[PDB]
Write a protein that binds this DNA or RNA. Structure first.
Ligand SMILES: CCNC[C@H]1O[C@@H](n2c(NCCCCNC(=O)CCCC[C@@H]3SC[C@@H]4NC(=O)N[C@@H]43)nc3c(N)ncnc32)[C@H](O)[C@@H]1O
Ligand SMILES: [K+]
Length: 391
DNA sequence: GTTCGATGTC
DNA sequence: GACATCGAAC
């Protein structure tokens, strides 16, 4: 972990004299060292590490060789700090964390917050909270993705009901790692959420209070402003105007008997996010390596037969939209079908969605937490009567 | 059915 | 920086 990030986290940390201080996934124990330097020696220092090659603590700390996620210590902790591992547990061809099926089963048994594919860092957070004494403190640096994503809804709700939470946005602070990070300071007492921005100087990071949600129950966390609130009440949410569906996935296309790996007569490309631009679709260029008869597309998704609005999923945090006039097969993106009794003006709605006001709105709210516009961000986009109207 | 990325690759 | 994963996962 970069030293300025450690120093900032250590500035947020507290323990009583003689308190038990833990660094999970400790390796050589950079957090233990920095905490001792800053606060003195009258604490019980413990580090937990799975790799024998990595555990290298000073003799004033106790080292334990264990999978932190399945470790059952005798006593609870006053302070838990550090940098959990980040990564989805799954097959090596697609995912970075590789464990026996039987171990993954033990994680799922252990963690009430485990949802969908989940992530080591979520499980590390839940484990840490469970190991805290009442009034205990944890301070972790983790990806920002938990503030917004469905996979982390149980985690947000768990935190909300277990104690009080402060979130400090750092962004892309790991050199040569593609992750936007936050610090979480959790205390196992009280309630509420405090959101903080930071400014980095030579001197280190400085927290700036952004907003407080004293009655937080685990809702998505956003950077809201007076302007984002004004826009949101200006119109109907997009999700009330449209059914929002996703493209059929690559394997469905690949095994479909009408799909081909080479162009040919009557054959059309299966479109991806690279075919979608602000306000238009490139129908000619193939980016998927897949081709099919256009008329057979409805066999994968019924809505492929009907011209409709498409919104991008993987262009970062922004709103890129086009009207698919032709009704082609897509491998990617959101597909929005108007609900019963909805009147639309496709041309002007697309213009509004691609507008600078809209790009600013989403960048404000969701910064760079994830490299997507997700469904939960998309369903909340405001649409005023000129563009779309539910009668 | 659709979700997610210590992203993957240019 | 540009420009987006794409298929295991549930
Ligand atoms: C934030 C960097 N983390 C690096 C360290 O975390 C370690 N580490 C890994 N990372 C995968 N999994 C665990 C388990 N679950 N328990 C304890 N330690 C852990 C790894 O051995 C590295 O030394
Ligand atoms: K790691």
């Amino acid at each position: 972990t970069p030293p300025e990030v450690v120093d900032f986290m250590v500035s947020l940390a507290e323990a009583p004299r003689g308190g038990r201080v833990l660094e999970p996934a400790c390796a050589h124990g950079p957090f233990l060292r920095a905490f001792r330097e800053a606060h003195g020696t009258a604490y019980r220092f413990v580090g937990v590490e799975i790799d024998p090659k990595a555990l290298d603590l000073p003799p004033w700390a106790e080292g334990i060789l264990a999978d932190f996620l399945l470790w059952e210590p005798g006593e609870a902790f006053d302070l838990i700090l550090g940098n959990p591992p980040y990564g989805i547990v799954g097959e090596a061809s697609k995912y970075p964390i590789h464990v026996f099926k039987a171990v993954k089963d033990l994680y799922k048994k252990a963690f009430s917050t485990w949802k969908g594919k989940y992530n080591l860092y979520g499980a590390f957070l839940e484990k840490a909270v469970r190991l805290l004494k009442p009034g205990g403190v944890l301070v972790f640096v983790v990806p920002a993705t938990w503030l917004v994503l469905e996979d982390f809804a149980l985690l947000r709700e768990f935190l909300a009901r277990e104690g009080k939470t402060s979130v400090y946005y750092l962004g892309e602070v790991f050199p040569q790692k593609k992750v936007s990070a936050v610090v979480i300071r959790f205390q196992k007492s009280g309630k509420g959420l405090s959101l903080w921005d930071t400014q980095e100087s030579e001197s280190g990071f400085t927290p700036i209070l952004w907003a407080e949600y004293p009655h937080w129950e685990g809702e998505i966390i956003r950077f809201e402003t007076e302007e984002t609130r004004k826009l949101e009440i200006s119109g109907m949410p997009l999700g009330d105007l449209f059914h929002i569906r996703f493209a059929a996935r690559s394997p469905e296309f690949k095994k479909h008997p009408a799909v081909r790996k080479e162009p040919g007569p009557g054959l059309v490309p299966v479109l991806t996010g690279r075919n979608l631009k602000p306000g238009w679709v490139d129908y000619e260029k193939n980016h998927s390596g897949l081709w099919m008869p256009k008329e057979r597309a409805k066999e994968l998704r019924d809505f492929y037969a009907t011209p409709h609005l498409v919104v991008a999923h993987t262009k970062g945090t922004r709103v890129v939209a086009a009207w698919d006039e032709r009704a082609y097969p897509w491998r990617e993106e959101f597909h929005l079908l108007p609900k019963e009794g909805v009147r639309l003006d496709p041309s002007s709605l697309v213009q509004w969605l691609n507008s600078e006001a809209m790009q600013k709105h989403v960048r404000t709210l969701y910064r760079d937490f994830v490299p997507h516009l997700t469904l939960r961000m998309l369903e909340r986009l405001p649409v005023r009567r000129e563009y779309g109207f539910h009668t």
